[PDB]
Amino acid sequence: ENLYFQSNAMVQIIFDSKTGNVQRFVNKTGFQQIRKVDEMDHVDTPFVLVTYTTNFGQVPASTQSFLEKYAHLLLGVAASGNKVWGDNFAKSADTISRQYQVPILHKFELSGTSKDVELFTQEVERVVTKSSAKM
Protein backbone atom coordinates (compact mmCIF):
# COMPACT_ATOMS: atom_id res chain seq x y z
CA GLU A 1 0.00 0.00 0.00
CA ASN A 2 1.17 3.49 -0.95
CA LEU A 3 -1.26 5.35 1.30
CA TYR A 4 1.36 8.03 1.98
CA PHE A 5 1.56 8.85 -1.73
CA GLN A 6 -2.22 8.67 -2.15
CA SER A 7 -2.90 11.10 0.67
CA ASN A 8 -0.01 13.51 0.00
CA ALA A 9 0.40 13.74 -3.78
CA MET A 10 -1.65 16.37 -5.62
CA VAL A 11 -2.94 13.89 -8.21
CA GLN A 12 -6.60 14.41 -9.00
CA ILE A 13 -9.13 11.61 -9.26
CA ILE A 14 -12.29 12.24 -11.30
CA PHE A 15 -14.94 9.53 -11.48
CA ASP A 16 -18.29 8.61 -13.02
CA SER A 17 -20.81 6.38 -11.27
CA LYS A 18 -24.47 5.52 -11.70
CA THR A 19 -25.22 2.86 -9.11
CA GLY A 20 -22.40 3.89 -6.74
CA ASN A 21 -19.84 1.09 -7.19
CA VAL A 22 -17.15 3.40 -8.62
CA GLN A 23 -17.93 5.86 -5.83
CA ARG A 24 -17.42 3.12 -3.24
CA PHE A 25 -14.19 2.06 -4.97
CA VAL A 26 -12.52 5.48 -4.92
CA ASN A 27 -13.60 5.88 -1.30
CA LYS A 28 -11.33 2.94 -0.52
CA THR A 29 -8.31 5.07 -1.46
CA GLY A 30 -6.61 7.90 0.41
CA PHE A 31 -6.65 10.33 -2.50
CA GLN A 32 -7.75 13.77 -1.33
CA GLN A 33 -8.88 15.43 -4.55
CA ILE A 34 -11.80 13.23 -5.60
CA ARG A 35 -14.69 14.65 -7.62
CA LYS A 36 -17.38 13.33 -9.94
CA VAL A 37 -17.32 14.20 -13.65
CA ASP A 38 -20.45 16.29 -13.13
CA GLU A 39 -19.31 18.59 -10.35
CA MET A 40 -16.86 20.86 -12.15
CA ASP A 41 -17.01 23.28 -15.06
CA HIS A 42 -13.29 23.08 -15.83
CA VAL A 43 -10.18 20.96 -15.36
CA ASP A 44 -6.76 22.62 -15.29
CA THR A 45 -4.66 19.96 -13.55
CA PRO A 46 -3.76 16.41 -14.75
CA PHE A 47 -6.11 13.69 -13.52
CA VAL A 48 -6.97 10.01 -13.35
CA LEU A 49 -10.38 8.82 -14.54
CA VAL A 50 -12.38 5.99 -13.00
CA THR A 51 -15.61 5.11 -14.80
CA TYR A 52 -18.06 2.20 -15.23
CA THR A 53 -19.42 0.26 -18.21
CA THR A 54 -22.81 0.47 -19.90
CA ASN A 55 -24.66 -1.56 -22.58
CA PHE A 56 -22.53 -3.78 -24.81
CA GLY A 57 -19.20 -2.75 -23.27
CA GLN A 58 -19.82 0.94 -23.98
CA VAL A 59 -18.44 4.06 -22.32
CA PRO A 60 -21.16 5.83 -20.30
CA ALA A 61 -22.53 8.89 -22.12
CA SER A 62 -21.65 11.21 -19.23
CA THR A 63 -18.04 9.99 -19.40
CA GLN A 64 -17.89 10.54 -23.15
CA SER A 65 -19.16 14.13 -22.73
CA PHE A 66 -16.55 14.75 -20.04
CA LEU A 67 -13.67 13.35 -22.09
CA GLU A 68 -14.38 15.27 -25.29
CA LYS A 69 -13.86 18.37 -23.15
CA TYR A 70 -10.99 17.46 -20.80
CA ALA A 71 -9.17 14.48 -22.27
CA HIS A 72 -6.07 16.65 -22.80
CA LEU A 73 -5.34 16.39 -19.07
CA LEU A 74 -6.14 12.67 -18.75
CA LEU A 75 -3.27 10.58 -17.31
CA GLY A 76 -4.87 7.14 -17.46
CA VAL A 77 -8.15 5.31 -17.02
CA ALA A 78 -9.62 2.62 -14.75
CA ALA A 79 -13.06 1.05 -15.23
CA SER A 80 -15.53 -0.89 -13.12
CA GLY A 81 -17.53 -3.67 -14.78
CA ASN A 82 -18.93 -7.14 -14.15
CA LYS A 83 -17.44 -10.34 -15.60
CA VAL A 84 -20.97 -11.64 -16.12
CA TRP A 85 -20.57 -9.58 -19.31
CA GLY A 86 -17.71 -11.72 -20.63
CA ASP A 87 -15.78 -10.10 -23.49
CA ASN A 88 -17.51 -6.81 -22.72
CA PHE A 89 -16.11 -6.77 -19.18
CA ALA A 90 -15.09 -3.20 -18.27
CA LYS A 91 -14.54 -2.53 -21.98
CA SER A 92 -14.92 1.22 -21.42
CA ALA A 93 -11.29 1.29 -20.18
CA ASP A 94 -10.06 -0.29 -23.42
CA THR A 95 -12.11 2.10 -25.53
CA ILE A 96 -10.94 5.18 -23.66
CA SER A 97 -7.32 3.97 -23.69
CA ARG A 98 -7.19 3.50 -27.48
CA GLN A 99 -9.30 6.57 -28.16
CA TYR A 100 -7.26 9.01 -26.08
CA GLN A 101 -3.91 7.24 -26.07
CA VAL A 102 -3.64 6.82 -22.29
CA PRO A 103 -2.77 3.73 -20.25
CA ILE A 104 -5.35 1.50 -18.61
CA LEU A 105 -4.66 1.73 -14.87
CA HIS A 106 -6.95 -1.14 -13.88
CA LYS A 107 -10.19 -2.99 -14.70
CA PHE A 108 -12.20 -4.39 -11.79
CA GLU A 109 -15.57 -5.80 -10.82
CA LEU A 110 -18.23 -3.71 -9.10
CA SER A 111 -16.84 -1.92 -6.01
CA GLY A 112 -13.55 -3.82 -6.26
CA THR A 113 -11.57 -5.94 -3.80
CA SER A 114 -8.68 -4.81 -1.61
CA LYS A 115 -6.44 -6.33 -4.30
CA ASP A 116 -8.04 -4.09 -6.94
CA VAL A 117 -7.45 -1.05 -4.73
CA GLU A 118 -3.79 -2.01 -4.34
CA LEU A 119 -3.21 -2.51 -8.06
CA PHE A 120 -5.06 0.68 -8.97
CA THR A 121 -3.25 2.93 -6.48
CA GLN A 122 0.17 1.49 -7.38
CA GLU A 123 -0.49 2.14 -11.08
CA VAL A 124 -1.56 5.71 -10.38
CA GLU A 125 1.79 6.35 -8.69
CA ARG A 126 3.67 4.79 -11.64
CA VAL A 127 1.85 6.84 -14.27
CA VAL A 128 2.12 10.07 -12.26
CA THR A 129 5.85 9.49 -11.81
CA LYS A 130 6.26 8.82 -15.53
CA SER A 131 3.83 11.32 -17.05
CA SER A 132 3.39 14.06 -14.45
CA ALA A 133 6.31 16.30 -15.47
CA LYS A 134 5.41 15.69 -19.13
CA MET A 135 1.60 16.11 -18.82
Ligand SMILES: Cc1cc2nc3c(=O)[nH]c(=O)nc-3n(C[C@H](O)[C@H](O)[C@H](O)COP(=O)(O)O)c2cc1C
Ligand atom coordinates in the same frame (compact mmCIF):
# COMPACT_ATOMS: atom_id res chain seq x y z
C1 LIG B 1 -27.69 -1.15 -18.40
C2 LIG B 1 -26.40 -1.71 -17.81
C3 LIG B 1 -25.38 -2.16 -18.77
C4 LIG B 1 -24.12 -2.71 -18.26
N1 LIG B 1 -23.12 -3.15 -19.13
C5 LIG B 1 -21.87 -3.70 -18.88
C6 LIG B 1 -20.93 -4.12 -19.83
O1 LIG B 1 -21.08 -4.07 -21.05
N2 LIG B 1 -19.72 -4.66 -19.28
C7 LIG B 1 -19.39 -4.79 -17.92
O2 LIG B 1 -18.32 -5.27 -17.57
N3 LIG B 1 -20.33 -4.36 -17.04
C8 LIG B 1 -21.53 -3.84 -17.47
N4 LIG B 1 -22.55 -3.38 -16.56
C9 LIG B 1 -22.15 -3.53 -15.09
C10 LIG B 1 -21.55 -2.23 -14.51
O3 LIG B 1 -20.48 -1.72 -15.30
C11 LIG B 1 -21.09 -2.48 -13.07
O4 LIG B 1 -22.17 -2.97 -12.26
C12 LIG B 1 -20.45 -1.18 -12.49
O5 LIG B 1 -19.76 -1.54 -11.29
C13 LIG B 1 -21.43 -0.22 -12.02
O6 LIG B 1 -20.84 0.93 -11.52
P1 LIG B 1 -21.83 1.95 -10.95
O7 LIG B 1 -22.10 2.00 -9.52
O8 LIG B 1 -20.57 2.67 -10.73
O9 LIG B 1 -22.18 3.06 -11.86
C14 LIG B 1 -23.83 -2.82 -16.87
C15 LIG B 1 -24.85 -2.37 -15.92
C16 LIG B 1 -26.12 -1.82 -16.35
C17 LIG B 1 -27.10 -1.38 -15.22
